[PDB]
Structures are given as C-alpha cells and as structure tokens.
C-alpha cells in the first residue's frame, strides 16, 4: 500500500479553482481509493471532466502483468519522477491543456497538475452542468517514441449527459522522465481502467469517493 496526496489548480474562462485530495493505492492488488475536495466555494466545470484527468494522471499504482513488469515505463521513472503534458479535446465543448508533475517525495507520492481550459460556450454540456455523477470504464493505448525518448498515450473518453447525450473527447498524452536513468519504454500496450464513484453522507461537503482498478495488457 502507498499513500498519495494530489493537489492541482485550473483556470477555465477566467475562473480559478484548486482541488486537493488524499488516498491510497495498492499496486499488488491493482486498486486505488481516492477522495478529493475543492477549497473554492464552487467548481465551474462538471466534476467528471477533471476526475478523469486526475485518475489518468497517475498510472504507477496501476497493476501490470508479470510479462509486462519490465515493459512498464512509469514505474521505472518513478524514483526521479516525470512530467506529463495532456491535450484533451472535447467534442464541441472546447479543449483542455494540462501539465502534470509526478514524484515520490520523501516516502509519499505527490502529484501537481496545472490545467487551462479554452473555447467554452454557454448552453453546452460543460457550461450547463448536464453531466451526471456516473462514470464509465475506458481503454488507453500507450506506445513509445525514441525521437521524444518518451511514452505517448491516446484514447477516447465517453462522458454521459442527463438527457442521454454522450460526448466523445479525444485524450492525448506525452510523458518525459525527469530523471536520467534507464527508460525501459514499452513498444505498445493497452491499459483498461474501471472507475466507480460514491459519496459519503456524513459531511455535507461533496466527497467524490473514487475507486479505480487498472489492468494492462
């Protein structure tokens, strides 16, 4: 078991919001349990749009098969951390540009994300908060690039809407290891992520109790 504390900030159409969260991840069992909270009074965009980014921002906890243990890249660069740049193009609802830094500081993992939102318009799903609290499992395809000496991930994420509309957003990610150690970049693989959400009625504050199960293949 490994504890994790992730603090991130994001600016969307002039609205600034910071979110801090804590939890634990079992790599052997391939499980992650997180709980977030926004210090600001209200968060502009729907929570899932950022919850998915926070979930996919860390893949070290994700369990890997025995044959893929040596193939993994995020664990190899874990001792010295890494920096990730993600472009998330929503379908007709603008685009997100995020820069993240992941590092095992002291004896605990730390994850710092900075998010920019652009091309947002009123009456959209993002602006109208029409997205519900449910989520969906997904698949992410990762492939190595020697020219960038890194790993590039790509996939499509389906976000649900109250009226039944489903928005397909394209996620692209590029990694760069902060350290100078061996890369051990995998040629190509796919990771399946299963996410569930729950809320704790003890506190009126929204909890976003988040559970992930990630498996590579």
């Amino acid at each position: 078991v490994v504890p994790i504390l992730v603090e991130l900030d994001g600016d969307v159409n002039g609205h600034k919001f910071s979110v801090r969260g804590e939890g634990e991840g079992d790599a052997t069992n391939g499980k992650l349990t997180l709980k977030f909270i926004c210090t600001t009074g209200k968060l502009p965009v729907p929570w899932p749009t950022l919850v998915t980014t926070l979930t996919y921002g860390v893949q070290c906890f994700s369990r890997y098969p025995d044959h893929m243990k040596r193939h993994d890249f995020f664990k190899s660069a874990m001792p010295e951390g890494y920096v990730q740049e993600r472009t998330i193009s929503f379908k007709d609802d603008g685009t997100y540009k995020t820069r993240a830094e992941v590092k095992f500081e002291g004896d605990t993992l730390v994850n710092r994300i900075e998010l920019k939102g652009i091309d947002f318009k009123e009456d959209g799903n993002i602006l109208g908060h029409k997205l519900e609290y449910n989520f969906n499992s997904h698949n992410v395809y990762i492939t190595a690039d020697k020219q960038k000496n890194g790993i590039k991930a790509n996939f499509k994420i389906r976000h649900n809407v109250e009226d039944g509309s489903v928005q397909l957003a394209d996620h692209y990610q590029q990694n760069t290891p902060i350290g100078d150690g061996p890369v051990l970049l995998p040629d190509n693989h796919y990771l399946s992520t299963q996410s569930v959400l729950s809320k704790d009625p003890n506190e009126k504050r929204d909890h976003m109790v988040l559970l992930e199960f990630v498996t590579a293949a």
Partner: nanobody
Framework: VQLVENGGACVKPGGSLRLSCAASGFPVNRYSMRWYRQAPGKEREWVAGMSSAGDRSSYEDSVKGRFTISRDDARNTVYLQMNSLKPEDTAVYYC????????WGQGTQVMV
C-alpha cells in the same frame, strides 16, 4: 446485475424490426439506458440514449427520429424501433447501463 438483448435479425431495405433490452438485478426506471452501435473493426459509437427521468431522448444527426426508443418500468424492458432502415444500421448493436460499476450488455447483431 445482468442485461439481455433480443430481437435482432437481418432486415431487407425498408423493413422495420424491434429490438428489446431487459435487465435483471436492478430497477431499469431508476437509471438511464443507452444504446451503442459498432461495425466490424470499427470504434464503438453511441447511437441512442434515454434520460433517466424519461422526459427526452438523445440521438445523433444521422438517425434522429428513427429509433424512437421507449421504456417500460412495469415490464422492466426498453424497446427499440428501426423505422426507416439505412446502411449505417448494418453495424451491430449493444445495450448499456451503468449502475455502480459499469455494465455492458451482450447485445445482438443486425445487418441489412
């Protein structure tokens, strides 16, 4: 919780067939139902959805006004009507509903 699909068979151009998706383990009326369509060797694409409250349904531009899906809570089943048949319907269908952790139905295959 399990989802079962039935009513799928090949249709001649212009024909109308009815698909049915039923659930066992959870109340269908409490949560929203969705329908996906994917072709051989093609990415899955959302083809239809009905809101949890059932006030309105969401469809894409290609097929807006054809599926005309309906839902029965007493019957615990959602019915889909082909109406006009187009080549895009050649792709196979899937019935999806996510209560807690997501659940994917077995679906049925239909081709023109």
């Amino acid at each position: 919780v399990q989802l079962v699909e039935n009513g799928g068979a090949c249709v001649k151009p212009g024909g109308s067939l009815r698909l049915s998706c039923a659930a066992s383990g959870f109340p269908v009326n409490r949560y929203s139902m969705r329908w996906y369509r994917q072709a051989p060797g093609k990415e899955r694409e959302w083809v239809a959805g009905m809101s949890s409250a059932g006030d309105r349904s969401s469809y894409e531009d290609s097929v807006k006004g054809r599926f005309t899906i309906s839902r029965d809570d007493a019957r615990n089943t959602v019915y889909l009507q082909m109406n006009s048949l187009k080549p895009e319907d050649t792709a196979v269908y899937y019935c999806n509903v996510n209560v807690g952790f997501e659940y994917w139905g077995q679906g049925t295959q239909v081709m023109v």
